[PDB]
Each structure stands twice: as C-alpha cells, then as structure tokens.
C-alpha cells in the first residue's frame, strides 16, 4: 500500500484503487511564517502538476521509487 | 543557470530564458537491458507530466530545491 516495500523498506504511499505516488511541496498556511513545507502520500489521480508549487515529484506507478 | 547555488552548491539546470528544474526517470535504450535510468538537467517548459514515467521531478522554479 505505498511504494517502497522490498529494497530499503521505506514505504509511504496509500493507493486505495490505482497505485499512484504523490509528493507535495509549497507554502502550507501564512506561506510567509514557516517557508515552504513538503508532504507526501498517496491521492486519487496525479493532476497535470503545476507552474505554481516548489516541488511535485510524481511516479504514477508503484515501487518505483529507491 | 541551476537550481542551488548558495546553500549545498549542487546546481546542475540552464534555464536559457525562464528558470524551470526538471528531471527524468524512465528507460532509455532497450528499456529491458539496463533497467531504468536517470536523468536531469533544465528544458523549455514543463510538461504536463505522464503516468507513463519513473519518476518527473519539476520545480518550475530556480534555487527551488535543497
């Protein structure tokens, strides 16, 4: 249920139908108190990215990450 | 003409006009015979991502990354 499970053991993901990785990072809240914050996980469909975030990492397959 | 150049020093882009980080994770070449490969460095814009990567990493930003 995430996308690291055999090599380094360091899963993290959720796909509750396809599997599909999803990071996200940009400003959470304020986005001028904290900086920019990341997160991760799984979600329903990688959407089209976008110009506007500080960095999205997408792999859209499972274990496919090491 | 990268992505960091202050704090590690670890730039490796060259926006030739916008600054726009992106990399590549898929096979190359026989895609059955080495494995999947790796690759980075800076292009025109961003595309809108695909399922059918590795791994895509785009920051659409410069000194976005750390």
Not at 23 to 46: H, M, N, W
């Amino acid at each position: 249920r995430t996308c690291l499970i055999s090599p380094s053991s360091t899963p993290q993901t959720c796909p509750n139908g396809q599997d599909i990785c999803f990071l996200k990072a940009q400003c959470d809240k304020f986005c001028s108190i904290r900086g920019p914050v990341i997160e991760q996980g799984c979600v329903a469909t990688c959407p089209q990215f976008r110009s506007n975030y500080r960095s999205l990492l997408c792999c859209t397959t499972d274990n496919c990450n090491h």
